[PDB]
Amino acid sequence: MITYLFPGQGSQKQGMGSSLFDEFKDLTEQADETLGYSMKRLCLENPYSNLHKTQFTQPALYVVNVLSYLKKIQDNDIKPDYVAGHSLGEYNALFAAGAFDFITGLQLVRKRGELMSMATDGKMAAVMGLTAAQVSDALQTHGLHTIDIANMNSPHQVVISGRKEDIERAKSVFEGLKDVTMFHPLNVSGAFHSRYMSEAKQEFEKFLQSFHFSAISIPVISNVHARPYEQDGIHSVLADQIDHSVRWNDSIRYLLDKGRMEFEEVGPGHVLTGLIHRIKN
User: Which residues are the active-site ones (predicted)?
Assistant: First the structure.
């Protein structure tokens, strides 16, 4: 069986979507009309360093991932057995699955980006060398119970998330731990996928109520639950995604467990492919 995997924030790169904007001119134009700027310009020239600001990053990745998908299936007229995507990427899996059309998904990710960009005074950090359980234990025992686990990416790669000052203290703590091989703050000023996104989540959930979804035709493994979406559960699972951990390791393991599974990353970069390899070994 095969799974298609869609990248999220962390995979954006200037030059992404290279060949595709010209090949899908109508879609790019539709995006530009909706967003108020040129998507080609954003991705290729990274004006004002906008590619790295979440309100731009999210729709940029969404659009590149869509065009990457449409191109892939234009050349190879195969549909995957499953799809998943990392945070932002989950919108691309839902699109591949037919839950919504292109512009619907673009509206949702534009709003998601906007709300998340309103977070300040937060930070996130990638922690390598420890299991999720060990990271959680370390947080609790060093007075850092206020920090959440935002991503569980592979068995020894976790991203933590919380108030700026708490993430600062955490650096010290983790650098003193022998098995930690890396502590690397990420380039955000919000504590994404944490309790500190409560407001954004509730605003997004309210926004969601205006939308109606179509049938999921390819199972989508949710970040929140590491299990397929249920047709009637799209609203709640998309809203929960904002303030809950991305259970990426468990999502991949769910897929591995079904037997002989291959994965292909659709979108820029090889980040998720790299994670597969660490999950398997």
Answer: 87, 193
Structure's resolution in angstroms: 1.7
* 11 tagged catalytic: no
Q: Are residues 172 and 34 in the same domain?
A: no
> Angle CA(120)–CA(121)–CA(126) in degrees, nearest 5?
100
Q: Which of 11, 68, 87, 117 is catalytic?
A: 87
Please confirm, yes or no, whether 189 is among the known catalytic residues: no
Report the C-alpha gap between 88 and 80 in whole angstroms: 19
Side-chain half-sphere exposure of 245, counting CA atoms within 13 A: 18
Adjacency order of strands within the sheet including 262-265:
82-85, 2-6, 262-265
Q: How many helices (H) and strands (E) does the chain have?
A: 12, 8
Residues 6+ apart with CB under 8 A from 153: 159, 246, 248, 249, 275
Boundaries of domain holding 205: 1-119+189-281
One domain for residues 15 and 100: yes
Q: What kind and span of H or E run contains 151?
A: strand 148-154
Do β-strands 182-185 and 122-128 pair in parallel, antiparallel, or remain unpaired? antiparallel
Listed residue (124, 179, 129) closest to 155, CA to CA: 129
Q: At what angle do helices 102-117 and 54-75 cross, to 10 degrees?
A: 150
CATH number at residue 269: 3.40.366.10
Same domain, 80 and 201: yes
CA distance 153 to 157: 5
Query: Which one is catalytic: 11, 117, 156, 193?
Result: 193
